[PDB]
Amino acid sequence: DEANIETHGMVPMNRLTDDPRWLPAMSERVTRMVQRDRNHPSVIIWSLGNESGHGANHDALYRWIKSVDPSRPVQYEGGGADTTATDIICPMYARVDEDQPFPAVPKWSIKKWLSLPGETRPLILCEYAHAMGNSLGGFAKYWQAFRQYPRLQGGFVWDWVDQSLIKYDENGNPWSAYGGDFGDTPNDRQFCMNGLVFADRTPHPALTEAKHQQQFFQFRLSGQTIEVTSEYLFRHSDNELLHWMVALDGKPLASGEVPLDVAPQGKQLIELPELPQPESAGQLWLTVRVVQPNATAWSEAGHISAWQQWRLAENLSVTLPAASHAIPHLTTSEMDFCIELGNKRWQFNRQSGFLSQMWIGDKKQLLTPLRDQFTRAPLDNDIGVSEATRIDPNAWVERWKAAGHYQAEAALLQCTADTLADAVLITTAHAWQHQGKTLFISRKTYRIDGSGQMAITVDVEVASDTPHPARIGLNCQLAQVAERVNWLGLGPQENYPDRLTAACFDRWDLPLSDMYTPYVFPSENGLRCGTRELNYGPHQWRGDFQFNISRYSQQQLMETSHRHLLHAEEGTWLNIDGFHMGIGGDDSWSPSVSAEFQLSAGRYHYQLVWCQK
Amino acid sequence: AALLQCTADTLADAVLITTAHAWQHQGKTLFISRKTYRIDGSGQMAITVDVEVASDTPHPARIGLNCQLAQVAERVNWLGLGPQENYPDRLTAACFDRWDLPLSDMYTPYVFPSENGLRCGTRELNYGPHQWRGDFQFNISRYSQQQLMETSHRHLLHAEEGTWLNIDGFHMGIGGDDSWSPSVSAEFQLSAGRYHYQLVWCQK
Amino acid sequence: DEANIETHGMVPMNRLTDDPRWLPAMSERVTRMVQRDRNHPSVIIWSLGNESGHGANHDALYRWIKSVDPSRPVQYEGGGADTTATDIICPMYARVDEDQPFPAVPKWSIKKWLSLPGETRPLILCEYAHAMGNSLGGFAKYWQAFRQYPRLQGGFVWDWVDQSLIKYDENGNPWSAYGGDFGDTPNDRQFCMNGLVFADRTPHP
Ligand SMILES: [Mg+2]
Ligand SMILES: [Mg+2]
């Protein structure tokens, strides 16, 4: 609970608090709270105010709470969260490993706070993990330090529900309004969402990550025994059933159910029976989940609370997919390479050096040719506080715009034609320049198998002065529209290379509209990671990659502002990428992507195989 | 090892020979490797290697290749890091510059004979009439690799004929903070599952 | 500086120390040190012993140093390096990020020592970075934490010089001998080097 004080506008932020002419008007908002809310059993921590500087009055009211009710502690944040007007330390937005110094109000690192000379109090965070748009990246690193150290205690997540308002058009259909669009000046135009769910209510994708790291059971594997440990403090395990399943490539072999009962703060060992070993290639996966059988007051029957996955002993493929008896044929022109095989054929535009048109039928498979891609639509965690009038150089979007990633273009260097005994090999190199400075280098080889599949190998090379690029991959525009998509990898939600601790590796099936996640502010969405097989319509893709298929393009998400003004384009845009950047973050105005997950190797490699039917 | 496949290819300006291998033991397949050989028209050679490691056997030591050259020279010339030795976990001391030394300083005689003398992060290697380009780690020695494992003292080693040369792509940190428990930290182990490297042989 | 006490063989390692029949023979090796080395300006930290368990005698001599010379601190290692017989924490071979638990004598992580409930003293390591053969790997990670945190202070490196002995063959040429090759039983055959330089002297890499 909290009184009603905030003075976040004055210069400096302790003018109306330190001056003692304002003591009567300020001490009628704390006294008349305590006399209203002191019988209830729920409130355990009082708090004075938020973002109002430090002064003498915040020391004056503190003994007034601590002298008329001694059974609860008192918490206060502003001024650095160390002063005499508090009992438990509570910084806002403090990082985990790195630290940043300011004049006169530092924010030290969370492991460094406790070891300063003469410090004994605990530490509960008041605000962490800002959550606008795609966020809650790097969330898993907090919940290792929260369980290893004894004296850290946890934190509070900003914020739960959106703040949107509705408004009607001339058709009668509504659309969610935001910020300063009613007709006021001035405004701030994006900082009103702060969403973990929508305003309906209907859950974001970002919630099911926070469900997983906060679970009440912890599991650990050893040999052939599984170990279950608890995290309750008062309750005995009355209704819990364990549910185990072994899996090979989407085909089940063994399953079972074991009843469970653990003491508080105890341990239990569960012995697994023998499991049959397969003969073909594959990685054996093990999945364990926890199910309640009866209905409580706050849940129905059949609720799920905890899960965990591991990798078991495996076996690797030995034989070779060879061979077939069909031989491809090729022929040349001054604009196009024509490589056919029976019904199916391929064409190569000379000047772009790209795949111009692929054929099944008598049917146009594609419109836009096969091309590399090096960027994304700017999310909220890299737009900063920059706008069209005031600029800021430390944000990511202004550095990329400054160097010229969005503007640069390619120039061709070399394409050669080769004919093997069973295949053909077409080699092509490219380079991207801007204002006379050479940005990026790429070299790729195309191989056309005799069976019917295609083998593509890519070698990219990045200069060391320009800032680090967003993605490394390629995209295209398919012409047919289907109903469902089928991927073999991770699911069922979305996930990024920094937020992937929540999924499990299994087969999944969904229709098309669930892949697009409509945010209120339109940006990039819907990448699936770690997959090994992709199936859509009549087409097939194999390798190790990250992907997203969408109805919408990539440029139109960058240009517009609202979510009700998007229109559907024809065809389906498909985007396949090799290596990708974490999103963070812990603030939204300073960059907060951690250094381990950036893209700074200098050299990279990836391989993929196209296939029909 | 057991061989699987080798094919011969003739381009317009080059030739391409493709070869795959696999290593097994007691009926369980340990390691997989696939490599391509390309012979340029200028005089140089281009070699590309793709290796693949199973996920149950513990993590291997190095990933590379070695050979036995027949001529003996006086000095070696490398372009990269120097002048001492360095490993991928102990490399904060060198600087990136040209260096020149005679042969005997490359072998560091410990009293207990073991592995020694890898140079890391280099970009050019020159010894005698030969030339190697890419991005790699290397050591050239008078001694073999097996005889360092077998014996016990340092005064009982004898010199073999020729020069053994060893070139490696990716390598393991050594630690450590104890000597009875393992102490190599988890960040510098070799657990990706897939790896890639490329190198170019050249004469004169 | 250090007195002359080590009892690393008995079972358990506090038999000859906790039993008070051995107090006179043990308190003639600390008293006659302090009266020999107290005028010099170089010594700044006294130390009782190494690897000898914990008992009552190590609490008994501690006030005897801290009552006849108050101008220097007193350091002691064994038993977990937390007990009442010391003033500055000194674990041996403690790691930096991961930790390993033992029964009854843990070795917690070096950033985790200072944040336990009711702990205020500094921390100087007594032994770190064992150095036989190719070693001193991962050494750079200590010297980031030594400069970021205020209250850590540094450590001591084992060991400086090799312990080799010479012996002659029939040719007259020498070779460095090690361990149990003279003709004794038993032996340990590699743990005598611990080298940062050779025995000449000539520096390691
Ligand atoms: Mg405010
Ligand atoms: Mg000892």
- Final resolution, Å: 3.6
**In the 8-state DSSP scheme, what is residue C15?**
H
Whether C127 sits among the annotated catalytic residues: the reply is: yes
E runs forming strands in chain B: 2-10, 15-25, 28-39, 45-53, 62-69, 75-82, 95-102, 119-127, 130-141, 163-171, 194-203
| Contact assessment for residue A338 and residue A330, using Cβ atoms and an 8 Å cutoff | yes
User: Residue C17 and residue A368: Cα distance in Å, rounded?
Assistant: 85
Determine contact, residues A563/A520, Cβ cutoff 8 Å.
yes
Cα first-last separation, chain C: 29
Instruction: For residue C201, say if its preceding peptide bond is cis, omega within 30 degrees of 0.
Output: yes
With vertex at residue A208, the alpha carbon angle to CA A50 and CA A307, rounded to the nearest 5 degrees, is 125
The owner of tokens 């009055």 is A57
Sheet of strand A217-222, all strands in order from the earlier edge strand to the far edge: A217-222, A225-230, A267-271
Contact C148 A111 (CB under 8 A): no
Amino acid at residue number C187: N
| Residue in B85, B92, B184 closest to C205 by CB | B85
Contacts of C66 (CB under 8 A, 6+ apart): C74
Count of CB pairs separated by less than 8 Å, A with C? 27
Residue B92 touches partner C, C-beta closer than 8 Å: yes
How close is the Cα of B181 to the center of ligand 2, in Å?
17
| Count of C-beta atoms within a 10 Å radius of residue C58 | 24
Expressed in angstroms and rounded, the spacing between residue C67 Cα and the centre of ligand 2 is: 29
The answer to whether the beta carbons of residues C91 and C127 sit under 8 Å apart is no
Q: Would you call B5 an interface residue with chain A, using a CB distance cutoff of 8 Å?
A: yes
Domains and CATH numbers, chain B: 1-204 (2.70.98.10)
Contacts of C34-40 spanning 24+ positions with Cβ under 8 A: C34/C65, C34/C68, C34/C69, C37/C1, C38/C69
Asked whether the beta carbons of A579 and A604 are under 8 A apart, the reply is yes
**Gap between the Cα atoms of A84 and A333, Å rounded:** 82
Chains that touch C (3 or more CB pairs under 8 A): A, B
Whether A117 has its CB under 8 Å from any CB of chain C: the answer is yes
Q: Is the peptide bond before A201 cis (omega within 30 degrees of 0)?
A: yes
- Give the integer Cα–Cα distance in Å for A325 and C6: 80
Residue of C nearest to B88 (CA): C137
- In contact, A233 and A201? CB cutoff 8 Å: no
In A300-423, beta strands by DSSP E: 304-311, 329-332, 336-341, 344-349, 355-360, 363-364, 371-373, 409-419
Contact A355, A369 (CB under 8 A): yes
Q: Which of C111, C117, C149 sits opposite A150 (nearest CB)?
A: C117
CA distance A544 to A531: 6
User: Which ranges constitute the DSSP H helices of A419-554?
Assistant: none
- Integer-rounded Cα Rg, in Å, for chain B is 19
Q: Which residues contact B101 (CB under 8 A, 6 or more apart)?
A: B75, B76, B83
Mutation pick from A277, A418, A444 vs chain B, by most beta carbons of B within 10 Å, is: A418
Residue type, A557: L
For residue C94, the distance in angstroms to the closest alpha carbon of chain A comes to 17
Q: Where are the alpha helices (DSSP H) in A61-166?
A: 62-68, 142-148
Q: Choose the closest CB to C115 out of A117, A118, A151.
A: A151
Residues 6+ apart with CB under 8 A from A200: none
Query: A271: helix, coil or strand?
Result: strand
Which ligand ends up closest to the CA of C158?
Answer: 2
Exactly one of A77, A127, A494, A524 is catalytic; name it.
A127
Q: Closest by alpha carbon to A283, among A313, A308, A253?
A: A313
Subunits in contact with chain B (3 or more CB pairs closer than 8 Å): A, C
Nearest-by-Cβ selection for C149 from A115, A148, A151: A115
A424-434/B45-53 β-pairing: unpaired
Query: What CA–CA distance (Å, rounded) separates A443 from A456?
Result: 11
Rounded to whole angstroms, the Cα distance separating C195 from C133 reads: 7
Residue A127 designated active-site: yes
Q: Degrees (nearest 5) of the Cα angle A93, A99, A102?
A: 80
Nearest CA in chain A to B196: A605
Residue A197 and residue B146: Cα distance in Å, rounded? 64
Q: What angle do CA A478, A480, A485 make, to 5 degrees?
A: 90
φ/ψ of A221, rounded to 5, equals -105, 140
Strands A484-491 and A528-536: antiparallel
Contact between residue B167 and residue B157 where contact means Cβ atoms under 8 Å apart: no
User: Measured between CB atoms, does B110 come within 8 Å of chain C?
Assistant: yes
Has A8 been labeled as part of a binding site?
yes
| C-alpha of A70 from chain center | 44
Q: How far is the CA of C52 from the centre of ligand 2 (A)?
A: 8
